[PDB]
Every structure is written in structure tokens, then in C-alpha cells.
């Protein structure tokens, strides 16, 4: 079912990027209605400006030019109880850099209880000219070869010590 | 018939307090909206019944003129108890006292009958 996964923090310039905000209900069985707001403040700036609101089935995106015309919704479709809210940007640009705050509003229907809740997820993204391999990924690759070389080296060294001893035994009898 | 335990005859001295004790027993657990208890008095066997106390959500004491303010509820119905108390009994209190208990979901209605006699 639903799992919460943090969004990627590095985006390549001039390429599409997907921002992930996933919020999971404590109990899957319960049914509630959700809506979301995403507000972004450009890097080196203070405060926040709401960029988009998604309620019901239609998505409403703020009119400002920085985010105008290059955003798409990757959230849950037709559920009306979204769970997963994600925003996809086409033609990523330098202007799209900074702190992104996404707030979720959920109406939970219980037997005689109606509950309204708010959860906030914050994602910070910095654009970059060329994508770079993560430290864990690069280090792991380098680390893997060293291990392979040592074992191979260990086996060869092992055979060499073993071979001389075996050969010597043959000579005596 | 419903299991209702009362003394068939209750003999009480004039001026003493008379507890009219009846036991009602049925399966399930009593419900306040559900449990209803009614008490009636008759001066004689064939005489018209006069309701003097009811349980409907709570105790309702009808304050019949014939009893003044001498009737009191004296039982915890949740215990299957629906007894009443007649304080400072007078000779005119002699007669027949009926307890009727209808308890949902039990369809059956219990009935206890006490013949109260007043000594001298």
C-alpha cells in the first residue's frame, strides 16, 4: 500500500523534475477527503507564496510567471482521497529553486465523528547544471572493485603458496 | 410466566414502615429506556387498580391522594429489584399491591401481587 518516500533534492537544468510529497493515513480502511496546497519561496528569499491548490478533481495553479505554464500533477487520480500528492515540472529552470512546503487537508469520516487534520511536508531543492552521482552510489562502485581485487588476489596468493608446497612434496618420495 | 418474587401476604403493624419486597428475574441486562416498572393498588380483590408509581426512564411517583407522600421507591431495578416502601402505614392501606414489569427485549411481562394487611 502507501509508503512515505522523501523527494529528490538535486535537479538538472533544462530537464523535467518530479517532486514527491506522500502522506499516508494511519489506517488504510478509513475513508477521508483530501485537498492540497503547495507554497514555494525562491532561494535567497524569505516568506512563502502559494503556487497551486488541488481540490476535488481540477488543479488550480497560481498565476505567477515563475511557475506559470510548466507544472503538471502526478498525484492520485480520481480517488478524491489523494494520499499521494506530487508535482511534476516540465522544462526545469533556475527560477524553480528554493524551499517547497506542501500542506495537506483531510476530512475523515467516522461513525459520528468528522475529523479535520493538517500535516506539513517540506522539500528543499537546488538546481544544478550537470547531474552528479550520489556519494553512496559512487563510493559503493569503487568499494566493490577493491573487494573483488582482494579476493582474486587472495586466491592467487593462496594458490601460489599452496602450489610451491605441493610441488616440493613430490620431490622427496 | 415471569419469575417475580413477592410475599403473597405481608402483615405490618399500623404506624410502622412497610417495605413491599418483590424479585423480578429475567435474562439479559436491564436498559433504562428499555426497563419499565409499574405499581398499582386496590382496596379489594375486585376493586379498580390505581397506579401509584411507575418507572419510565426514571421513577415517577404519582402522589396519589390516598397515600399522601408516604410512598417511596425502595429498589435498585438493575439488581432485578423493584421494591417500594410505604411509610407510617395506615389502616386504609390494607389491600392488594401489584408490580408489573415489562423488560425489553423480554416480551413477557412479570406480575407480583402482595396482599398487605394492617395489624392493630
Amino acid at each position: 500500500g502507501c509508503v512515505e518516500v522523501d523527494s529528490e533534492t538535486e535537479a538538472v537544468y533544462g530537464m523535467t523534475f518530479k517532486i514527491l510529497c506522500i502522506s499516508c493515513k494511519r489506517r488504510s480502511e478509513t475513508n477521508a477527503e483530501t485537498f492540497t496546497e503547495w507554497t514555494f519561496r525562491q532561494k535567497g528569499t524569505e516568506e512563502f507564496v502559494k503556487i497551486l491548490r488541488y481540490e476535488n478533481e481540477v488543479l488550480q495553479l497560481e498565476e505567477d510567471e515563475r511557475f506559470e505554464g510548466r507544472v503538471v500533477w502526478n498525484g492520485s487520480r480520481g480517488t478524491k482521497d489523494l494520499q499521494d500528492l506530487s508535482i511534476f515540472i516540465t522544462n526545469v529552470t533556475y527560477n524553480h529553486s528554493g524551499d517547497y512546503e506542501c500542506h495537506v487537508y483531510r476530512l475523515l469520516f467516522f461513525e459520528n465523528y468528522e475529523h479535520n487534520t493538517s500535516v506539513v511536508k517540506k522539500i528543499h531543492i537546488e538546481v544544478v547544471d550537470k547531474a552528479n552521482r550520489d556519494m553512496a552510489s559512487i563510493v559503493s562502485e569503487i568499494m566493490m572493485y577493491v573487494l573483488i581485487v582482494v579476493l582474486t588476489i587472495w586466491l592467487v596468493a593462496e594458490m601460489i603458496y599452496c602450489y610451491k608446497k605441493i610441488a616440493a612434496a613430490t620431490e622427496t618420495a | 410466566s415471569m419469575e417475580v418474587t413477592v410475599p403473597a401476604t405481608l402483615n405490618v403493624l399500623n404506624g410502622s414502615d412497610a417495605r413491599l419486597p418483590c424479585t423480578f428475574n429475567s435474562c439479559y441486562t436491564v436498559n433504562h429506556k428499555q426497563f419499565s416498572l409499574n405499581w398499582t393498588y386496590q382496596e379489594c380483590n375486585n376493586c379498580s387498580e390505581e397506579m401509584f408509581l411507575q418507572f419510565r426512564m426514571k421513577i415517577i411517583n404519582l402522589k396519589l391522594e390516598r397515600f399522601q407522600d408516604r410512598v417511596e421507591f425502595s429498589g435498585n431495578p438493575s439488581k432485578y429489584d423493584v421494591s417500594v416502601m410505604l411509610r407510617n402505614v395506615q389502616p386504609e392501606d390494607e389491600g392488594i399491591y401489584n408490580c408489573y414489569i415489562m423488560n425489553p427485549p423480554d416480551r413477557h411481562r412479570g406480575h407480583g401481587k402482595i396482599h398487605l394487611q394492617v395489624l392493630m
Partner: protein, 1140 residues
């Protein structure tokens, strides 16, 4: 003179028969349940005959001498009482009329005396109980200790319920509680999980939980199950544990405690089920079986024109060609059966017609043959043969419906039996069945008599209550499916209890009939009823049973593989390689970093294994390498991994089956089997027995096939019903009687669905599946409700229209489960016996090193006397010492411990502060007295005291008790951990364990378990690995399935911790049907084929019906095979210890 006549009357052939005939007739009457008024006179007649029989016995025997001859025999006392109650009943009687009838029930008992040999059989069963006494104390002690541990650890836990956070009117939790008692009322306030009886259980810890947002967790109110399921009091805890020991609905208790307590407590259940249930039950079987052998064997040892018509006769008898014709017929019959096997809920007319024609040819072939046999052998000669008598009825029945009831046909399936003579096993199944009504007929008859008495007794006692209360166990105020109102129904409940299903029914008997009565009756049926069943099973089973530089290089590699570091290094890789498997789950996406290292890590592993394999080839060569079973296993695994790597590495590839090949990766833990000596040994034992196991499976399939075929004819296509989708409630049938009618409703109504069961009798394969659930007793009841309810193929099911169909299930259980299991158990244990004989009479479950250790433990058995010790020179030593060696001192201490144990029992949830302080102080005195005893033994004994093993345990317990005490105190002043505090107080249960030293009987039983620990460990290791491979297969395959029944948050396949929890439950085979239910549904509207699954790439939650069925079924069978092993290991050790 009169005495002679009476005496003459007393011993007569007819009189015993006359007394007996009347008694059997009376039994039919008891079954009335509201007999007509006219029957009363009949009642009078029965009373008179009893008195008349009694008078002759009393008149002749007594000689007016005080009836010395008459009352001397024990059996007559029962007889004397029955007549009297009737006289007494007429005479002023006690108030309880319902109670009054039960006494008359004993008349039925009188039957034991009247039948020949029943008196002998019952006495033997009772003789059996005397042996069982010691195990009983241990069960009580064992159940008692666990009850104490359970109570301390889980008291008040079942109380948790989600409670709403915001309340109108300033109400408080306490204020709300007194005000509401209504069921609807309880619901608004607390969560309540969608139509369930009680509020959802919540938890404080991160592992357990959880309550929906807007609801908070607080503990208040009654425990679930009417308050019956709780750990609050010692008595209640004892009932909960007893249920766990017999494993009745244990799956539910485990699920409930785990949810409230948190998953970490799963450990408590593993130890209790593993030691408390598997072990305790086994002990009972060994003792009953062991006891039966002595008595059975001990008793056995003491004993030791006209001529022309005849001309035709030469031809036929010459034409029978017994070499070809009889042999030809069996082959022909098997073929007909296969023809019968072809059926479905929906069949086109053309297919149906072929069945009609195929049946006729078969009808024609057998019929020609039947006439032929009699002419050749004539009627007297022909009819005499037993099989022939059997066949003519078969021919006769076929002919009768040749052109003329549905029920009549269903019998055609039986013919298939003739195959038994040729087959060796078929012979075994038939032989076992014969004993039940043959030599063991008297014993089997007792079981029938006992079941009858209980059904009637239950009916008399609780029959009236069920009808009046109803509402105390239903909403429609109508009778539940299982009830005690009628004899057939009362009988069904008793039958269910014979299978281990008592708790579900018992809660209900209690709601209507009260706790004291319901508990006593059910407990007796279970103990007494089961003992008879156990005796029959065991009795039946036992009786039935009896340059050339290349050469140097090749030598060197051999050196490397043989070397210990390498063997050791390889094993580490296997454990490490297997472990990486656990990390992949639905949550792998979070923690992206671990995912990257794991992906890279596998490549290093693939290279190491491929490298290792090459060394194997050079060292062993191809011929040696491929003639080994293990190597082939190793080679196959590296290859699958290798193909994925090249395909992944080669690139391009990654479509369809290539992905499927990857799932086989779960198979990796398998290499590990060769490496561990303990694990490998268990496998040797299994391979040895697969051929033997194989013959039986075929017999069962043949036996089951008849039942499955029979089942298909009766219920195929009749399980469909129109149900309201919102609450899944079948419509009345007053409206929507047939499928055609149901569809019209859908057109004008949104949520009505016409739907099948999912496990049913639509086809022979499905019938095979439905039958398996019924045999196991898991998930069976859902099916039976369907079978009885059913009316016709396209018609809506009426409620209990069939009613008697239950007979079909009852017969299958007796034959399908009781007999085959008897056969399954008999062959497997025997095969194990042969294996032991072959390997020089040594146990087959232990590694050589384990064997040396096992012998050392054997030494502990010896009682050679240890040195007495010397009374010190000093008087104080003499005085202090003189008291300790006294017999009274041990008894006084022993009594003291029992007194201590009773104190622990008094603790209960909600005890007042005053009670808590006294218990604390009372314990301190014991803490002081016990510490005091230890010091005293030490002053007198000195170094000698440390010599005894028991003294050391006693000394250690005191240190733990005092230390546990300080720690509890220390925690209070500086910390506030409730969970931590409960665990610390657990230290005291240690003193209770000292009770064991005093009882020699229990000590021997406990010691035996210790002996089998080495064998049990190996099986446990093997079992763990199999569970592990399955968990991995499950995580990839079943995560994402829709959550329905048995699958919900927790107890789901989403992660490795979760998968392990489920697999453990299913090991006992419990609730296996429940897990399988979500996997089965495929396609709308059962499930949505493409689902978003936020946070992940995969689409759909549809179970694979084919893959799912193989997985659950295979696991059930495999676990069962290993469990047979525990049964075998425990029995062997038990015989040896008792034997000494």
C-alpha cells in the same frame, strides 16, 4: 418357590434382551424436546419395566437378607437410583424441572451394562486415567506458570480502545461511561471496526497501534468477546491459556494480544505454543499410548433341455477368461470414474449428452458382465462371494435409475472401490476401517454412546435458554447457526467439540446459560470425549500396525576447498547473502542509500559463488561433481543468479519471464541446507520417507476423489447468492428468489451482486480444495453454511433448506480426516522406525557431536548416593545443621513456596492501593524467609552446599529475587517505565519453579523434555529456514494484495517482520484459509487490476490464484510433515525415560 421362579426369571436369554430393547426405545424418546402430552403414558410404561427388572434382581439376590447379593455390585447402584427418582419425581420434588430431566438421562447409561462387553471396555478406559494423573498435575502446573507470566505481562491490555479526542458538552471519559450501555451508543464514542462485535484494540508502542487520527488511545470498558477474553484475573488468564494449549482459535488470541501489547511480545506466544502446546499434548499421547500397550499386550499374553443349458456353461466359464476379463474390468471401471469426474457448474448441452452416452456404454459393459458371472457360477455359487454380493447391488442400483432421484444417483460414485485387492495400501485403508466396526467395534460403540448422552444432556440443560435469550447472541433475535435447541443441533455442537472447536460455541452458551453451568459441561465433554477419541485412534492405529602439470593444480585446488577457512568463509557468505534478501520490501524505496549498496553487494556475492563453483569443478572433476545431489542444488542456484546478472548486465533484457526468473532469488537461502550438520540430518530423514509417504497420498486422492465427486454432484453450482454489497447480507428470498430475479434488482439498484463462494464444489479440482479446508477444520464452517442453505442451481438459497446435508460433512470428517490421518500417522512413524533400525539402532535426528552430548545427559539419570557431609564440630553448626537435614525442614519450605504461589494468583486488574501494599509486604517476608533458608543451609553445609545442583538453582533464585526487588525500587525513584517494570517483577516467578524439586513425578516428565532438546533443535533450525524462504517469496508475491480477511495492517506481507509473524501462525495450520482468501480474488469487481500504490512502481493488488494456491497448500503440507517429526522425537525420548 418364588425365589426359584424369580431366579429362574433372572437368568434367561430373553430377559437380558427384553431389558435392553426397552432401553434403546427410551433413547428415541429423550430426543423429543417437547414431547406430546400423550407420550406421558409411554413414560409411565418405561418406568414400570425398570422397576420390574429391578425387583427380580433385588428379590432373588437379597433373599430378604438386606439385598446383599443385589447391592454388592457397583453397576446396580446406578440402576437403583433411576427408578427412585421417577417415584420421587411423582413424590414431592425439587424446583428445577429442566434439571429434573437430566437425571433420567442415566437410563441411557444403563445400556452400558446390558450390552455384552461394554462393561469390560469402560473399565479399561478408566484404568487409563490412573496413568494420566501425573501428566495432569504437570499440565496444571505448566498452565499455571504460564498463566502467572501471562497475567503479569498482559494484565489490563485487552482493555485498550480508541477514544475520541474532542467531546461536546465538557464530558470526560469517566462521565461518558456510566451514562451509556447501548450498543449503538458504545459505537459513536469508540472506533469499532466496521460491523465487528467490539471496539478496535489499540496500542501505546510504535510496533502495535494504531488509532485513526482524531481518535486517542485510552483503556476502559470490557475485554473483547463479551469480556470472556481477558488476562485480568488468574482464573480468566487460566482459561485463555488453556485455550492456547489446545489451540482452539488461538490465532485470534494471538492477534489480539499482539495488537495491544505490540509485536515484540510475539515471543511469548512462540515459547508457549512451542513448549506448552506442542509438547504438552504430545506427552498426553505418549502416556495414553504407552499405557494402552501394557494392558493390551498384558491381556493378550495370557491367552498365548437341462443338458443343453449346461453346454453353454462350458463356454462362459471358459469365456470368463479370468486372466483378461476381470483384469480388463478394473481398468474399464477406472475409466468410467474419470468420465464421472468431468462436471462443472455450467455445461453446454452437447457435453452433457456425451456424459449420458458415456455412462450408458459403461452401464452396458458392467451389466453384460453381471449376467455372465452368475450363469457361470450359478446363483448359489455366484451370490456367495462377498465381492459379488457387493457388485450386484451396484448393477441393481444403476438399472433402477436407467430410465427413472438426484440423491439416488450420487451413489454411483462408490463402485471405484474394487481396485483395493491389487493395491497394497488400499488394503491398509480398508483394514483400518474394518477394525473400527470389527474387533474394536465395542470400543467404537462406546464413543457413539458417549456422544449421544452429551448431546441429549446439553439439550435438556440449555435447550430452553437458547430460545428465550436469543437476543443475547444476535440482532434479528433469531437462533444462531450453532445452538443447542434440538437434538440434531445439540448433536452438531457436541460433534464440533470433538474436533477442537469448543471456545467459539462456549462463549455463547455462557451468555444464555450462565458461566458455571456452561463451563462444567463443555469442560467435561472435552476431557472425557477426547480421551475416548484418543483411545480409539491410538488403539486402532497400534492394532492395525501389528608434463602433466595439470595434476598438481588439480591436487592443490582440492586442498583449498577442503581447508577450514574456505569452508568457513563460504558459510559466512551464505548467511550474509541470505540476509540481504530481508531488506527488500515495500519500504525499500525509503532509505534509497541501502538500496544502492544492496544492489551492488549482490554482484560481489554472485562473483564469489561463481568463483567457488569453478574451484569445485577443478577439485572434484565433472563426474564427481554431478553425481552429488547437493551440488546440483548449488549449480542450479548460481545459474539463475548468473542469468539475471548477464541479462541485467547484457542489457536490453528485462521483459516478462526474465523478471519472473528473478523471484527465484528467494531460493538462495537454500544453499545453506548443505552447510549445517543439524539441518542436513533432518533432510536425510525426510528423503528416506518420501517414497513411503507417496503411496498414501495416492490412496487419499482415491478416497478423497469419491468424496469430491460425490460433493460435486450435490452442491455444484448451488453456492451462488444475491448479496447486499455494503454489508454482505444475503437477501431474504421472499424477493429475489432466483438468479434471473436478482439481475432485475441490479438494473434498478446500485449495490446488489450475485456471487459465488470462491472455494466450492463447482468442479472436481475446486471440490478438492473445498474438501481440504473441511478436513483441516479451518475455514470449513463458511462452506457448510453454504451447503445446508442451498436449494437449486439458479435459485437463491433458502436458510437451512437442506439441513441434513451436515451428514455429508460429518461422514467425510470421520472417513476423510479421522481414518486417513490414522493411516498417515501410522505409516510415517513406522517408516521412521525402519530407518532407525537400519542405522544401527541410533536416533536419526542428531549430528555425531550431539550424540556424545546426549549420552552425558543420560548420566544425570543415575541415583548413586552423593556424600552425606559431616556435621560440623561446633554445636551451632550441629544445631543449625541438625535442623536443615530434618525431613520437616524441606516440607516446611515446600509448603511455604506453595503459600507464595497463592499470593501471586490473588493479584487482579484494578486492585485497590491497600491490597497492593499488603501483597508487597507479604512478598518481602517470603523474600526474607527464603533468603533466610539459604543462609541457614550455608552455615551448616559450607562447601558441601555448593555441590548439589538444586542448591545452586535455589541460591541463584534468591539473588534474582532480591536484585529484582532493588531494581524495581530503583526504577521508581528515578524512572517511569511501566513496560520495563513489569518485566523486572518477572524475576520472582523464579521461586515458583522450586516447586518442581519436591514433585518426583513431574521431575521425570520435565527431564525427558530436556533429553529431546538436541533433536528438537535440529528440526527447529530446518523449520526456521523453510519459514524464511517462504517469507521472502511471500514478500515479493503478496504485498499489494487487497486487504480483506486475515490480511490487514499488521499480519500482512508488506515487510519481513510482518511476513514472519504470519508464517508462524500458519505453521500450526491455523487460520490458513483466512490468508488465502485475499489472494484468490482476481478481476473486477473483486479487485482493481491497475492500482496506483503511492510510493511505488508496481500496479495492481490482484492475487495470483494459481500461485497463491500452490504456496499456501505447499506450506501447510510441509509444516505438517516436520511437525510429525516433533511428535516422533518426543515419543522416542519419552518411552526411554519412562522405561528406565
Amino acid at each position: 418357590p418364588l425365589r426359584r421362579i424369580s431366579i429362574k426369571i433372572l437368568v434367561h436369554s430373553l430377559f437380558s434382551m427384553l431389558i435392553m430393547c426397552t432401553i434403546l426405545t427410551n433413547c428415541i424418546f429423550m430426543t423429543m424436546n417437547n414431547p406430546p402430552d400423550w407420550t406421558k403414558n409411554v413414560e409411565y410404561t418405561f418406568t414400570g419395566i425398570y422397576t420390574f427388572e429391578s425387583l427380580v434382581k433385588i428379590l432373588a439376590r437379597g433373599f430378604c437378607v438386606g439385598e446383599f447379593t443385589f447391592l454388592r455390585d457397583p453397576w446396580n447402584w446406578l440402576d437403583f437410583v433411576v427408578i427412585v427418582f421417577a417415584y420421587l419425581t411423582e413424590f414431592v420434588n425439587l424446583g428445577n424441572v429442566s434439571a429434573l430431566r437430566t437425571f433420567r438421562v442415566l437410563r441411557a447409561l444403563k445400556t452400558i451394562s446390558v450390552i455384552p462387553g461394554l462393561k469390560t471396555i469402560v473399565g479399561a478406559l478408566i484404568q487409563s486415567v490412573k496413568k494420566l494423573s501425573d501428566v495432569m498435575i504437570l499440565t496444571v502446573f505448566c498452565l499455571s506458570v504460564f498463566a502467572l507470566i501471562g497475567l503479569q505481562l498482559f494484565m489490563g491490555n485487552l482493555k485498550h480502545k480508541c477514544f475520541r479526542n474532542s467531546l461536546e458538552n465538557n464530558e470526560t471519559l469517566e462521565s461518558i461511561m456510566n451514562t451509556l450501555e447501548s450498543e449503538e451508543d458504545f459505537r459513536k464514542y469508540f472506533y469499532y471496526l466496521e460491523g465487528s462485535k467490539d471496539a478496535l484494540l489499540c496500542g501505546f508502542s510504535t510496533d502495535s497501534g494504531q488509532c485513526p487520527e482524531g481518535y486517542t488511545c485510552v483503556k476502559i470498558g470490557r475485554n473483547p468477546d463479551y469480556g470472556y477474553t481477558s488476562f485480568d484475573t488468574f482464573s480468566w488468564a487460566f482459561l485463555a491459556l488453556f485455550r492456547l494449549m489446545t489451540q482452539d482459535y488461538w490465532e485470534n488470541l494471538y492477534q489480539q494480544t499482539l495488537r495491544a501489547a505490540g509485536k515484540t511480545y510475539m515471543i511469548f506466544f512462540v515459547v508457549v505454543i512451542f513448549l506448552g502446546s506442542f509438547y504438552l499434548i504430545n506427552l498426553i499421547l505418549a502416556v495414553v499410548a504407552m499405557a494402552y500397550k501394557e494392558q493390551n499386550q498384558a491381556n493378550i499374553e495370557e491367552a498365548k433341455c437341462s443338458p443343453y443349458w449346461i453346454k453353454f456353461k462350458k463356454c462362459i466359464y471358459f469365456i470368463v477368461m479370468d486372466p483378461f476379463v476381470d483384469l480388463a474390468i478394473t481398468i474399464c471401471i477406472v475409466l468410467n470414474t474419470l468420465f464421472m469426474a468431468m462436471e462443472h457448474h455450467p455445461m453446454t448441452e452437447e457435453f452433457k449428452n456425451v456424459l449420458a452416452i458415456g455412462n450408458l456404454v459403461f452401464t452396458g459393459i458392467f451389466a453384460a458382465e453381471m449376467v455372465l458371472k452368475l450363469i457361470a457360477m450359478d446363483p448359489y455359487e455366484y451370490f456367495q462371494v462377498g465381492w459379488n454380493i457387493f457388485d450386484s447391488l451396484i448393477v441393481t442400483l444403476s438399472l433402477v435409475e436407467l430410465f427413472l432421484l438426484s440423491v439416488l444417483r450420487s451413489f454411483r460414485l462408490l463402485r471405484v472401490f474394487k481396485l483395493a485387492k491389487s493395491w497394497p495400501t488400499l488394503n491398509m485403508l480398508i483394514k483400518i476401517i474394518g477394525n473400527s466396526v470389527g474387533a474394536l467395534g465395542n470400543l467404537t460403540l462406546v464413543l457413539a454412546i458417549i456422544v449421544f448422552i452429551f448431546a441429549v444432556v446439553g439439550m435438556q440443560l440449555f435447550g430452553k435458554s437458547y430460545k428465550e435469550c436469543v437476543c443475547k447472541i444476535n440482532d434479528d433475535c433469531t437462533l444462531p447457526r450453532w445452538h443447542m435447541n434440538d437434538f440434531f443441533h445439540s448433536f452438531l455442537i457436541v460433534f464440533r467439540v470433538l474436533c477442537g472447536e469448543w471456545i467459539e460455541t462456549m462463549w455463547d452458551c455462557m451468555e444464555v446459560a450462565g458461566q458455571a453451568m456452561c463451563l462444567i459441561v463443555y469442560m467435561m465433554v472435552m476431557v472425557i470425549g477426547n480421551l475416548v477419541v484418543l483411545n480409539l485412534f491410538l488403539a486402532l492405529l497400534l492394532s492395525s500396525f501389528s608434463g602433466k602439470i595439470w595434476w598438481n593444480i588439480r591436487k592443490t585446488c582440492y586442498k583449498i576447498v577442503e581447508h577450514s577457512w574456505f569452508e568457513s568463509f563460504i558459510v559466512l557468505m551464505i548467511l550474509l547473502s541470505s540476509g540481504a534478501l530481508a531488506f527488500e520490501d515495500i519500504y525499500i524505496e525509503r532509505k534509497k542509500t541501502i538500496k544502492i549498496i544492496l544492489e551492488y553487494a549482490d554482484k560481489i556475492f554472485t562473483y564469489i559463488f561463481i568463483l567457488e563453483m569453478l574451484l569445485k569443478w577443478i577439485a572434484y572433476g565433472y563426474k564427481t561433481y554431478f553425481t552429488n545431489a547437493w551440488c546440483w542444488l548449488d549449480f542450479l542456484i548460481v545459474d539463475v543468479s548468473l542469468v539475471t546478472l548477464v541479462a541485467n548486465t547484457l542489457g536490453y533484457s528485462d521483459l516478462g519471464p526474465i523478471k519472473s526468473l528473478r523471484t527465484l532469488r528467494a531460493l538462495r537461502p537454500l544453499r545453506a541446507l548443505s552447510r549445517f550438520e543439524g539441518m542436513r540430518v533432518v533432510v536425510n530423514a525426510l528423503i528416506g520417507a518420501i517414497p513411503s509417504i507417496m503411496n498414501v497420498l495416492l490412496v487419499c486422492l482415491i478416497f478423497w476423489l469419491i468424496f469430491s465427486i460425490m460433493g460435486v454432484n450435490l452442491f455444484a453450482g448451488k453456492f451462488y447468492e444475491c448479496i447486499n454489497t455494503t454489508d454482505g447480507s444475503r437477501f431474504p428470498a421472499s424477493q429475489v428468489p432466483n438468479r434471473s430475479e436478482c439481475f432485475a434488482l441490479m438494473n434498478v439498484s446500485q449495490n446488489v451482486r450475485w456471487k459465488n463462494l470462491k472455494v466450492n464444489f463447482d468442479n472436481v479440482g475446486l471440490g478438492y480444495l473445498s474438501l481440504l479446508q473441511v478436513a483441516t477444520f479451518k475455514g470449513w464452517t463458511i462452506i457448510m453454511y453454504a451447503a445446508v442453505d442451498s436449494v437449486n442451481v439458479d435459485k437463491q438459497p433458502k436458510y437451512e433448506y437442506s439441513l441434513y446435508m451436515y451428514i455429508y460433512f460429518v461422514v467425510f470428517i470421520i472417513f476423510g480426516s479421522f481414518f486417513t490421518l490414522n493411516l498417515f500417522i501410522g505409516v510415517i512413524i513406522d517408516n521412521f522406525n525402519q530407518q532407525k533400525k537400519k542405522l544401527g539402532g541410533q536416533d536419526i535426528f542428531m549430528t555425531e557431536e550431539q550424540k556424545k552430548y546426549y549420552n552425558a545427559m543420560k548420566k544425570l539419570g543415575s541415583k548413586k548416593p552423593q556424600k552425606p557431609i559431616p556435621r560440623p564440630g561446633n554445636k551451632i553448626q550441629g544445631c543449625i545443621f541438625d535442623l536443615v537435614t530434618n525431613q520437616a525442614f524441606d516440607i516446611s519450605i515446600m509448603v511455604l513456596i506453595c503459600l507464595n504461589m497463592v499470593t501471586m494468583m490473588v493479584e487482579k486488574e484494578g486492585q485497590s492501593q491497600h491490597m497492593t501494599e499488603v501483597l508487597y509486604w507479604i512478598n518481602v517476608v517470603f523474600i526474607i524467609l527464603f533468603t533466610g533458608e539459604c543462609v541457614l543451609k550455608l552455615i551448616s553445609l559450607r562447601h558441601y552446599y555448593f555441590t548439589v545442583g538444586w542448591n545452586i538453582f535455589d541460591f541463584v533464585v534468591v539473588i534474582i529475587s532480591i536484585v529484582g526487588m532493588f531494581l524495581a525500587d530503583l526504577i521508581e525513584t528515578y524512572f517511569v517505565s511501566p513496560t520495563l517494570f513489569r518485566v523486572i517483577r518477572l524475576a520472582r516467578i523464579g521461586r515458583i519453579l522450586r516447586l518442581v524439586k519436591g514433585a518426583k513425578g513431574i521431575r521425570t516428565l520435565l527431564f525427558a523434555l530436556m533429553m529431546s532438546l538436541p533433536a528438537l533443535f535440529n528440526i527447529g533450525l530446518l523449520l526456521f529456514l523453510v519459514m524464511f524462504i517462504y517469507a521472502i517469496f511471500g514478500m515479493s508475491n503478496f504485498a499489494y494484495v487487497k486487504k480483506e480477511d486475515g490480511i490487514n495492517d499488521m499480519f500482512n506481507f508488506e515487510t519481513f517482520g510482518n511476513s514472519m509473524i504470519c508464517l508462524f501462525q500458519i505453521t500450526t495450520s491455523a487460520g490458513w484459509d483466512g490468508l488465502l482468501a485475499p489472494i484468490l480474488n482476481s478481476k473486477p469487481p473483486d479487485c482493481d487490476p491497475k492500482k496506483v500504490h503511492p510510493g511505488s512502481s508496481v500496479e495492481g493488488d490482484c492475487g495470483n490464484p494459481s500461485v497463491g494456491i500452490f504456496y499456501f497448500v505447499s506450506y501447510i503440507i510441509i509444516s505438517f510433515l516436520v511437525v510429525v517429526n516433533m511428535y516422533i522425537a518426543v515419543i522416542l525420548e519419552n518411552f526411554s525415560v519412562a522405561t528406565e
